[PDB]
């Protein structure tokens, strides 16, 4: 995708206060949940109301999903190596928690309009 | 008056819920953000998982079998609930927070 930037997560990001910012809607966040690292929190700012697509792509076979809520609840839908949803979001800050329920592995996270 | 047993942050360390219709007390304070539990169904039926928040914070749960079947708690104010038909087997129930800190009670009703 033209201009898509790959950006690494920034640990410690295990709570909402410590969330890694997704600075725009054309970034691919790269993260890992190995061993005792079982939660990676992200945030993003919606500036224009509209449908946002959230897609987590597993790079390894493990049990991982996500939960979104506004600062002011949407769950990832697990389908094999993709965990996705589409949701109409109003302007404001959102908190996107990627967390595992089994195993260990790496993932990429794409939040798009 | 049964209580969770830390550390229970992963499924291999899950706190056993010994019986249905039995209240478990837990907390997710500060950097304790995950409490894993397990339970065993012996007869197929509808199970009603109910988490009661004792403080206002963002907490929910995720159920999966020991064997992509996954079920999420539905947040409604201070209750996080669902009803799911389960076949005999072992299940893992992850109670986790997404904001704040607080105490809760958990039941697997049947
Ligand atoms: Ca990580
Ligand atoms: Ca992390
Ligand atoms: Ca606990
Ligand atoms: Ca715990
Ligand atoms: Cl039973």
Curated annotation (Swiss-Prot), chain B:
Binding site for Ca(2+) 5: 4, 6, 27, 32, 35
Site (C-terminus of form C1c): 13
Phenotype when changing residue 72 to A: S3b fragment has 12-fold decreased affinity for collagen
S3b collagen-binding domain: region residues: 3-110
Cellular compartments annotated: Secreted
Effect upon mutating residue 96 to F: S3b fragment has 12-fold decreased affinity for collagen
Site (described: Collagen binding): 62, 72
Biological role: Clostridial collagenases are among the most efficient degraders of eukaryotic collagen known; saprophytes use collagen as a carbon source while pathogens additionally digest collagen to aid in host colonization. Has both tripeptidylcarboxypeptidase on Gly-X-Y and endopeptidase activities; the endopeptidase cuts within the triple helix region of collagen while tripeptidylcarboxypeptidase successively digests the exposed ends, thus clostridial collagenases can digest large sections of collagen.
Family note: Belongs to the peptidase M9B family. Collagenase subfamily.
Domain remark from Swiss-Prot or TrEMBL: The mature protein has 4 domains; a metalloprotease domain (S1, approximately residues 111-786), S2 (877-882, equivalent to PKD), and 2 collagen-binding domains (CBD) S3a (997-1003) and S3b (1008-1118). The S1 domain has collagen hydrolytic activity. The metalloprotease S1 domain is composed of 3 subdomains which together resemble a saddle; an activator domain (residues 119-388), the catalytic peptidase subdomain (398-670) and a helper subdomain (679-790) joined by a Gly-rich hinge (387-397). The S2 domain (799-880, PKD) is flexible within a larger structure (S1 plus S2, residues 119-880).
Protein name: Collagenase ColG
